[PDB]
Amino acid sequence: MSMVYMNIMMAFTVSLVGLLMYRSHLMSSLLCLEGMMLSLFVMAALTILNSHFTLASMMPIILLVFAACEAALGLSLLVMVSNTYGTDYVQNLNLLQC
Amino acid sequence: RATFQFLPDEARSLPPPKLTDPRLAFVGFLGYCSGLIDNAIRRRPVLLAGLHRQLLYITSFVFVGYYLLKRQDYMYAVRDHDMFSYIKSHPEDFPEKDKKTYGEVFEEFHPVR
Amino acid sequence: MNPIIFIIILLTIMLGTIIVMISSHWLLVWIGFEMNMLAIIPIMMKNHNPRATEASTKYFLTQSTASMLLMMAVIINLMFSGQWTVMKLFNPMASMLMTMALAMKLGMAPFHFWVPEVTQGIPLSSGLILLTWQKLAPMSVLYQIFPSINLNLILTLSVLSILIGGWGGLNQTQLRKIMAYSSIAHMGWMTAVLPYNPTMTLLNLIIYIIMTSTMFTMFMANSTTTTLSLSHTWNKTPIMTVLILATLLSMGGLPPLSGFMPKWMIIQEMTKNNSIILPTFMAITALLNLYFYMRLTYSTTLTMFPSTNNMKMKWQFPLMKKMTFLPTMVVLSTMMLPLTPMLSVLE
Amino acid sequence: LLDLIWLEAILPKTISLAQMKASTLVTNQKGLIKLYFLSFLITILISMILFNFHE
Amino acid sequence: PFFDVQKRLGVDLDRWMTIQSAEQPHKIPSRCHAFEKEWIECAHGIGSIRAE
Amino acid sequence: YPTKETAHWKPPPWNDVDPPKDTLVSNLTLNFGPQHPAAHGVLRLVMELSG
Amino acid sequence: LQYGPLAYILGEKATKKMTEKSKLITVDGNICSGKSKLAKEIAEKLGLKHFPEAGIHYVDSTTGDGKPLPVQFSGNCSLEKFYDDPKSNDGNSYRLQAWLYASRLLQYADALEHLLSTGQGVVLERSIYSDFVFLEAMYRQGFIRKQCVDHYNQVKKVTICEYLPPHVVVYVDVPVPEVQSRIQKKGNPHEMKITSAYLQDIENAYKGTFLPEMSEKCEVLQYSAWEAQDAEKVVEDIEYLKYDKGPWLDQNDRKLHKLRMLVQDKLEVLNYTSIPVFLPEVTVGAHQSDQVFQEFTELPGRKYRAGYNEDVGDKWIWLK
Amino acid sequence: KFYIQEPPHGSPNWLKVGLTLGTSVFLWIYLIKQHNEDVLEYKRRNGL
Amino acid sequence: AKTVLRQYWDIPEGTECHRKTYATTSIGGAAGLVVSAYSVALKTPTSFLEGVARTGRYTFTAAAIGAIFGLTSCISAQVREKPDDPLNYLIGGCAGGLILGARTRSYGIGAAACAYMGLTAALVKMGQLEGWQVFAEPKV
Amino acid sequence: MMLYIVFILSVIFVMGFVGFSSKPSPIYGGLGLIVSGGVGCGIVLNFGGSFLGLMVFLIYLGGMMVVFGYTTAMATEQYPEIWLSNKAVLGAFVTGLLMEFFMVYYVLKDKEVEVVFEFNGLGDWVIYDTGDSGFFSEEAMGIAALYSYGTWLVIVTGWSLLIGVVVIMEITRG
Ligand SMILES: CCCCCCCCCCCCCCCCCC(=O)OC[C@H](COP(=O)(O)OCCN)OC(=O)CCCCCCCCCCCCCCCCC
Ligand SMILES: CCCCCCCCCCCCCCCCCC(=O)OC[C@H](COP(=O)(O)OCCN)OC(=O)CCCCCCCCCCCCCCCCC
Ligand SMILES: CCCCCCCCCCCCCCCCCC(=O)OC[C@H](COP(=O)(O)OCCN)OC(=O)CCCCCCCCCCCCCCCCC
Ligand SMILES: CCCCCCCCCCCCO[C@@H]1O[C@H](CO)[C@@H](O[C@H]2O[C@H](CO)[C@@H](O)[C@H](O)[C@H]2O)[C@H](O)[C@H]1O
Ligand SMILES: CCCCCCCCCCCCO[C@@H]1O[C@H](CO)[C@@H](O[C@H]2O[C@H](CO)[C@@H](O)[C@H](O)[C@H]2O)[C@H](O)[C@H]1O
Ligand SMILES: CCCCCCCCCCCCO[C@@H]1O[C@H](CO)[C@@H](O[C@H]2O[C@H](CO)[C@@H](O)[C@H](O)[C@H]2O)[C@H](O)[C@H]1O
Ligand SMILES: CCCCCCCCCCCCO[C@@H]1O[C@H](CO)[C@@H](O[C@H]2O[C@H](CO)[C@@H](O)[C@H](O)[C@H]2O)[C@H](O)[C@H]1O
Ligand SMILES: CCCCCCCCCCCCO[C@@H]1O[C@H](CO)[C@@H](O[C@H]2O[C@H](CO)[C@@H](O)[C@H](O)[C@H]2O)[C@H](O)[C@H]1O
Ligand SMILES: Nc1nc2c(ncn2[C@@H]2O[C@H](COP(=O)(O)OP(=O)(O)OP(=O)(O)O)[C@@H](O)[C@H]2O)c(=O)[nH]1
Ligand SMILES: N=C(N)NC(=N)NCCc1ccc(I)c(Cl)c1
Ligand SMILES: [Mg+2]
């Protein structure tokens, strides 16, 4: 494939690894989720734009809309996690082992 | 054959299940059992309470079961219609054998000594 | 939650699932999953306690991750075919990513870790939706993409799910965690037969849903969530202990009950394709599920556990729970084996 | 020696012990988001490198 | 689709955007329009197993 | 099956509610004045703020 | 319609039935402190429903034909046996206290259901909020083990959290020496065996823990023995209260609907009073439980759901 | 015995009883005429 | 795994044992690493050094079981001049079980391993001979 | 050098991703996502999608403004971590850059590169269309069709956004 795809696919993989390798802050992982969607938007936009798939030009826009619904949903849960424990640390969410 | 149709039109060329179908009698029986369980979980007299409710359990089961049995019969008719037509379309894959008798075919004998 | 808001949110859970099942376009399939995930989270958080918050968070992170892998597969598929039709995929890398994406959505092993924890952290009514309705959409996608799925991958997931589900349930005293590991074990049977006969995947899915709905409804009827709390049922409602016994023996797959039907038809399809070792391994490993079903029947119906004095107060009040469809569901869960040939309705 | 011991040991008692051990390995988890998702990365990597599920 | 309600009801929900050779605004063609048309018409009705 | 790694596991609450953490979200403390246009130059208003 | 989400959607909202007179009032005090009389007079003057203090046979009064049931259908817990032998080996002391709390929990749910569904306030004599004083007195005198106290607290912490405290807490402060004389005049031979130290422990819990707690969230009125002798003066105080604190200010139709769904479902109310915690004082063996349960179902009008017992004249069973 | 509180199901709910019986009757008639219709269509299509 | 598995099955039974032992060792070592990775990921080691210690302990145990099975099964075939006899893998399978038992300091594990590994390995050779399919390709 | 404009921007795209993927303080992660969103807009714009590029930049700028606010409220510590402050963050950061730098170095040297899959390094312009002369923007025609062809898409997206408001109100009402 064209060389641009090497870096966009690489960017998606970097964010996927960033998502799967947690640290403490839950906000940091939510950012990696937003980054994953950004690479998908760009990767989809390139294909659609380059192939002149006219009606598919709206598809990346629709992608962003449900990205915001996910980010808003993620932030809502972060608020509740923060209220319970006073931090957004993911090590506090370990009550359900038992 | 018709896309997302419970009973295609061609299914009407098959005979409908009889209303005395043994399978339909069993379905009606399951409705009767459901009615009894309904009384029991709610701590009502199992056999006597709410005969109107018990009637509707039997009737609803038989109603739904009749259509399921009709589609069931239809899908097996379709399977055979497909299978036989395919055999007709490909004779060379289903060749008729020459049937030897047992006086000609050699089978080995294994004594039970 | 306002009752009207609860109904609107529930209908949105169903609308997202319906969209997935009726869509011919990969983008609308992805939208259906996203809409479904958005609506279910408030049902998980309905009681607002730290365990519900933890459960919803773990659920959101898992499902959101799966959707990104799902959309990655769709875009890779678009590059290598230039279309969006929901059908076989045209790139093996896309097939793997989509297959993993659906495995995480279903909670199949080794993507299973969330299922026991999320189920434990949410009420029983929400757990019922999670372990039943939420299986429909991912399975409906596997039903359409299986001609391009890697056989080794899908059978590996099925094998691991049956083992981990069976082993995982042996150590559980919490009912919601018992149902969760049971669900993992049953997911494996559905996907094991998918490469050979998708019609048998639907049959197992439908029968699993009926039996799983029956159990959850009976747990809700008595507000029981632990083994010991359920062991008091013989002193409140004796009839409910017999229904639990019949349903649990059915989930174990014992003839002549209904739950034997899917295990039986799956073994038939696998043997027709010269798969002998795998169904044998699967049937024996399902004995682990029967074991921890049998423990529940012992503590619930076939013995009488110690009671408490305050239990006498409950004798004077009737069951008020709705228990919707329980009489029908329990009969279907148990007495359906004579009608096995009706599986052709799913063809 | 046989009926109360060895015929028990080499089958029901050994099998049930193995299942009990495996159950403990499966279920003894920390309930930590970080560890579960770190195992997802391992699963994905071995899927491509060892078993070539992506080909 | 798992359930083909679109066909049963004869309503077009999403198949207008499934392929790039479908009707586009102002009849703007995709770059691979001819190639995909030829492939779609070759494989029409015979099934994937044969079309492969 | 008790094990060493689960010796510290307790049965969950009967009603699913874990007790609220005693964690203290500290209020922000701010020197409002003396050197401040609204403090009249000599007021050291020590204010605790949440937001 | 039986109450539920559908009834709520159509307009059955508590804010429509509640007024300034829809109040929950609890009269508390020591034994033989004049609670009953004062509570009954407050209820009659204000137009509220009076609930006599929940006893062993309270639940019987709300089910069946309303008569007390034989004592085996309450565990044989006896108040008289508690007074005679407060250290009975058979655990009667705690078994009684656990039973009484559950009876009060049920009475509180019934009271709340009445308040929410009709808007008429109620008057109670003691409640789940004040029942613990008797548990503290029992423990300080050695009548129950510490394990019983731990059990009691577990049951309380998962039940009292679900309800709203009473609007008004009326308290009659009668000092112990006067209480002992009052008991001596009352004439119940078992009740005369109460030690004064036990009575002082009831008073120490009331003054030490109960009232300081209720002050934060309820309107508390304390009346000496003589002030309580005129309920008309008590009613006058209640009529001019501010009602400026407590959780009732924070309630709305959405919350009172959820609360009403709980209290109308009595098995849901009593769910955690039988947690599987095996104390000897409250654990019952299977053979005893099975036998008593069978006898209970052989009582008149108790075999089937209410309205399906033909042994007591229910009709149209085949259509009901 | 004579209940202290009037039972919720103390008397039949005649509106439900009518609906329940009316539905059972309706479904039964619908089933029978369908079966008769199918029998006649089946004979027609097969030259019987 | 397909490449290493193919190499093992491409050199005839009983011939070129050293090459066989490399294949079974390669399979064993990989299996041990897979076990270490999940173990380290899901049961965090207290120190980086220990996590390495756990990794080497599992990878060596796994590789030993592979090498001894590959050595025993080939040497038994060559010695007995019975290249295509399932019994050779039974000898190799049990020997592996003993190595596992030794590495665990548990006779009972060693006894059970020698059996179940013995049967499982012998079952694999029959499957190769008769074409038993584990992940059978769909056909009908 | 200008013929490789999309490649250069895509290199910065990855560098921004390594930025926030190594997970320093979310303050700096948001900075890395803004840079990536900025150059990502530049990449899409250079393929003829001016509206798509500017829109994704605009959305992500609004999103990272909220994330900033939530960070100072709910994801802050006494010593927020930069990339150099933490050993795990630095190791991931360096590893990302070295993996990136080696992909770039070899794809430029050989005009091709195998990184798992084969990528051609002739420059990204080679795949572009050769004959355009319409009096409109094809991306604008495709996007505007959402309101004539995408009735179904409009309904499901509009409904999801409304439900989204209802849901976040439910989720955060303790
Ligand atoms: C032609 C009919 C052939 C019968 C086939 C039976 C097959 C099993 C059907 C299962 C459904 C049974 C009905 C649901 C149970 C409800 C009955 C109950 O709960 O208790 C018995 C009850 C009498 O007790 P009571 O509660 O006081 O009610 C007063 C009414 N006289 O009510 C009664 O008076 C008795 C009602 C039936 C009792 C059934 C007992 C359980 C049977 C299950 C065992 C398994 C069945 C055999 C397996 C082979 C199947 C052929
Ligand atoms: C696969 C082969 C086997 C075939 C399996 C077939 C299964 C599907 C068949 C349907 C299964 C459910 C049938 C339930 C029958 C019992 C209904 C009944 O008696 O209701 C009594 C009454 C409510 O009846 P009512 O709503 O007034 O009637 C009008 C309905 N439009 O009031 C009551 O007391 C009802 C309470 C008990 C019922 C449980 C709660 C469910 C509520 C259902 C409402 C009524 C549904 C009407 C069913 C019609 C189905 C054709
Ligand atoms: C049909 C062809 C296909 C074949 C598949 C098999 C069909 C059978 C499916 C069964 C479906 C479940 C319904 C079974 C109905 C059982 C009825 C029953 O148990 O009697 C009710 C009674 C409840 O007590 P109660 O309502 O209060 O009455 C007064 C007594 N206290 O009960 C009791 O009081 C008993 C309490 C003690 C518990 C004893 C438990 C041992 C007896 C269990 C028998 C049922 C086993 C069913 C399992 C399948 C059997 C094949
Ligand atoms: C012969 C080929 C096929 C055989 C298949 C047999 C599978 C196993 C069936 C029985 C499973 C029973 O599972 C469990 O076994 C152990 C002993 O074995 C029992 O436990 C009993 O023995 C063990 C050890 O001897 C003791 O530690 C324990 O105190 C005692 O109660 C359990 O009460 C039973 O629940
Ligand atoms: C041919 C295949 C046959 C497959 C048969 C189906 C297998 C079903 C396996 C069920 C295994 C669970 O069964 C479990 O076994 C162990 C025996 O070690 C029992 O454990 C018992 O013995 C062990 C040690 O001997 C004690 O530590 C324990 O206190 C005691 O309870 C468990 O009480 C039982 O729950
Ligand atoms: C033809 C190919 C043959 C391939 C053979 C593959 C064999 C399978 C090997 C799986 C990995 C080894 O399996 C692993 O070994 C180590 C041995 O230390 C065991 O470890 C156990 O024994 C020792 C001593 O107690 C310690 O390492 C450890 O504390 C303990 O848990 C693990 O419990 C086991 O899970
Ligand atoms: C705890 C018990 C777990 C279940 C145990 C079940 C054991 C079942 C045995 C595995 C199946 C048989 O094992 C597998 O058979 C196939 C034949 O189809 C062999 O297939 C082989 O055949 C040719 C030779 O003709 C080889 O050159 C080639 O490398 C390979 O394709 C595999 O090399 C073997 O690995
Ligand atoms: C914050 C850090 C940011 C890091 C950003 C990293 C950017 C990545 C570097 C990309 C460099 C591209 O480098 C580009 O390679 C091609 C190779 O054909 C060169 O193009 C070349 O083509 C012809 C070949 O016939 C030569 O005659 C010509 O002299 C030369 O220009 C460009 O002159 C050069 O600019
Ligand atoms: N052990 C115990 N006894 C209780 C409890 N509640 C009431 N009692 C007893 O029930 C009897 C009646 O209670 P009281 O109302 O306080 O006594 P009284 O004679 O009626 O005096 P009045 O306040 O005027 O009504 C007393 O003997 C109490 O000790 C309780 O929770 N535990
Ligand atoms: N095995 C599959 N994947 N498909 C499948 N069920 N093939 C079998 C063919 C079949 C069987 C029964 C019927 I009735 C019909 Cl009509 C067709
Ligand atoms: Mg009194």
UniProtKB/Swiss-Prot annotation, chain D:
Organism: Bos taurus
Protein family membership: Belongs to the complex I subunit 5 family.
Localisation: Mitochondrion inner membrane
Source superkingdom: Eukaryota
Function per UniProt: Core subunit of the mitochondrial membrane respiratory chain NADH dehydrogenase (Complex I) which catalyzes electron transfer from NADH through the respiratory chain, using ubiquinone as an electron acceptor. Essential for the catalytic activity and assembly of complex I.
Transmembrane segments: 31-51
Subunit field text: Core subunit of respiratory chain NADH dehydrogenase (Complex I) which is composed of 45 different subunits.
Protein's recorded name: NADH-ubiquinone oxidoreductase chain 5
From Swiss-Prot, chain E:
Domain of life: Eukaryota
Protein location: Mitochondrion inner membrane; Mitochondrion intermembrane space
Motif Cx9C motif 1, residue range(s) on this chain: 32-42
Role this protein plays: Accessory subunit of the mitochondrial membrane respiratory chain NADH dehydrogenase (Complex I), that is believed not to be involved in catalysis. Complex I functions in the transfer of electrons from NADH to the respiratory chain. The immediate electron acceptor for the enzyme is believed to be ubiquinone.
Subunit structure comment from the entry: Mammalian complex I is composed of 45 different subunits. This is a component of the iron-sulfur (IP) fragment of the enzyme.
Sequence similarity: Belongs to the complex I NDUFS5 subunit family.
Domain comment (free text): Contains two C-X9-C motifs that are predicted to form a helix-coil-helix structure, permitting the formation of intramolecular disulfide bonds.
Name of the protein in question: NADH dehydrogenase [ubiquinone] iron-sulfur protein 5
Gene giving rise to this polypeptide: NDUFS5
From Swiss-Prot, chain G:
Assigned GO CC terms: cytoplasm; mitochondrial matrix; mitochondrion; respiratory chain complex I
Residues forming coiled coils: none
Residues the record lists as Phosphoserine modifications: 215
Main location: mitochondrion
Modification sites for N6-acetyllysine: 87
PTM summary: Phosphorylation at Ser-215 by PINK1 is required for the binding and/or reduction of the complex I substrate ubiquinone.
Subcellular location field: Mitochondrion matrix
Cofactor(s) listed: FAD
Gene Ontology BP, a term: mitochondrial electron transport, NADH to ubiquinone
Modified residues (N6-succinyllysine): 87
Superkingdom of the source species: Eukaryota
CDD domains tied to this protein: NDUO42
Classification via Pfam families: dNK
UniProt keyword annotations, A-Z: Acetylation, Electron transport, FAD, Flavoprotein, Mitochondrion, Phosphoprotein, Respiratory chain, Transit peptide, Transport
Function: Accessory subunit of the mitochondrial membrane respiratory chain NADH dehydrogenase (Complex I), that is believed not to be involved in catalysis. Complex I functions in the transfer of electrons from NADH to the respiratory chain. The immediate electron acceptor for the enzyme is believed to be ubiquinone.
Subunit structure: Complex I is composed of 45 different subunits. This a component of the hydrophobic protein fraction.
Similarity-based family: Belongs to the complex I NDUFA10 subunit family.
Name of the protein in its database record: NADH dehydrogenase [ubiquinone] 1 alpha subcomplex subunit 10, mitochondrial
Protein encoded by which gene: NDUFA10
Swiss-Prot record, chain H:
Membrane topology: Single-pass membrane protein
Glycoprotein listed as a keyword: no
One term under GO cellular component: respiratory chain complex I
Record key words, sorted: Electron transport, Membrane, Mitochondrion, Mitochondrion inner membrane, Respiratory chain, Transit peptide, Transmembrane, Transmembrane helix, Transport
Top-level division of the source organism's lineage: Eukaryota
Localization of this protein: Mitochondrion inner membrane
Entry's transmembrane regions: 14-32
Complex and partners: Complex I is composed of 45 different subunits.
Assigned protein family: Belongs to the complex I NDUFC1 subunit family.
Function: Accessory subunit of the mitochondrial membrane respiratory chain NADH dehydrogenase (Complex I), that is believed not to be involved in catalysis. Complex I functions in the transfer of electrons from NADH to the respiratory chain. The immediate electron acceptor for the enzyme is believed to be ubiquinone.
Protein name: NADH dehydrogenase [ubiquinone] 1 subunit C1, mitochondrial
Species per Swiss-Prot/TrEMBL record: Bos taurus
Species lineage: Eukaryota, Metazoa, Chordata, Craniata, Vertebrata
Residues represented out of the complete protein: 28 to 75 of 76
